Amino acid sequence: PQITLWKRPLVTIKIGGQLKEALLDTGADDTVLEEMNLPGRWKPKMIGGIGGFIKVRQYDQILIEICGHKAIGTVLVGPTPVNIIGRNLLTQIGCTLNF
Amino acid sequence: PQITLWKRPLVTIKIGGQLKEALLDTGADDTVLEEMNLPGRWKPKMIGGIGGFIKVRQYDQILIEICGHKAIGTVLVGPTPVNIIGRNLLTQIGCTLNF
Numbered sequence: 040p041q042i043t044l045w046k047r048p049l050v051t052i053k054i055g056g057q058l059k060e061a062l063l064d065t066g067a068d069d070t071v072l073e074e075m076n077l078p079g080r081w082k083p084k085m086i087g088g089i090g091g092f093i094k095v096r097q098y099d100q101i102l103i104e105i106c107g108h109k110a111i112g113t114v115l116v117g118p119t120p121v122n123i124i125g126r127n128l129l130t131q132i133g134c135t136l137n138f
Numbered sequence: 139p140q141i142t143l144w145k146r147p148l149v150t151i152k153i154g155g156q157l158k159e160a161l162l163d164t165g166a167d168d169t170v171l172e173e174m175n176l177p178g179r180w181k182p183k184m185i186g187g188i189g190g191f192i193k194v195r196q197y198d199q200i201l202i203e204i205c206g207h208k209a210i211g212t213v214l215v216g217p218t219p220v221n222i223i224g225r226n227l228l229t230q231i232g233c234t235l236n237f
């Protein structure tokens with residue numbers, strides 16, 4: 040679909056079999072979700088944002104459905120203010136910016 | 139144009155008579171620019187992201203040109219690591235997300 044930007048580009052995602060809301064974020068290299076339980080092995084990682092760095096759990100090759108489009112990739116879990124879908128998964132669902 | 143997301147969506151902007159590179163960021167409500175001494179009145183503000191908050195100066199009715207398309211609105215100036223074009227200006231150039 041075509042998504043305009045008058046409101047936050049919030050969409051419903053499915054991950055670990057649960058539904059959640061997340062922001063499509065072209066300024067984010069990586070996908071970061073609020074704390075949640077996810078199956079699988081993970082490793083500690085650090086990521087930086089506008090205000091400094093946070094510690095996250097890095098889960099590799101996770102299935103996530105974004106408005107019904109499937110992606111399989113890296114998902115970071117940690118104390119983000121909002122669930123964000125970054126470019127690593129936006130590229131998999133075929134997202135572009137147009138103006 | 140159409141901008142794919144394999145790489146960071148960096149574009150040239152013109153603001154206060156100067157050229158800069160800036161990230162087109164659908165996850166950013168507002169526009170945040172690197173330290174720059176703009177003329178006119180401003181108001182202090184705090185904006186938050188991953189890692190916490192930063193102190194910025196809020197300027198109103200600032201003209202920015204983004205790949206030849208003009209936009210006018212609020213611009214926040216402070217110690218951001220990157221120039222960020224947010225939805226307040228992206229809407230004005232008709233920018234949409236398409237997958």
Ligand SMILES: CCOP(=O)(COc1ccc(C[C@H](NC(=O)O[C@H]2CO[C@H]3OCC[C@H]32)[C@H](O)CN(C[C@@H](C)CC)S(=O)(=O)c2ccc3ncsc3c2)cc1)OCC
Pocket residue numbers: 062064065066067068069070071086087088089090091092120121123125163164165166167168169170185186187188219220222224
């Ligand atoms: C030189 C580089 O230094 P650096 O690496 C960080 O650089 C950076 C690169 C890009 C961005 C843009 C930010 N992306 C992000 O956090 O992405 C992370 C996840 O993926 C990784 O890739 C990029 C970073 C990692 C989002 O797109 C927009 N954000 C809001 C978002 C959290 C929704 C609430 S916002 O900027 O917080 C913001 C902007 C305007 C605004 N108006 C009112 S609120 C408000 C808040 C910030 C910093 O670390 C040094 C400590």
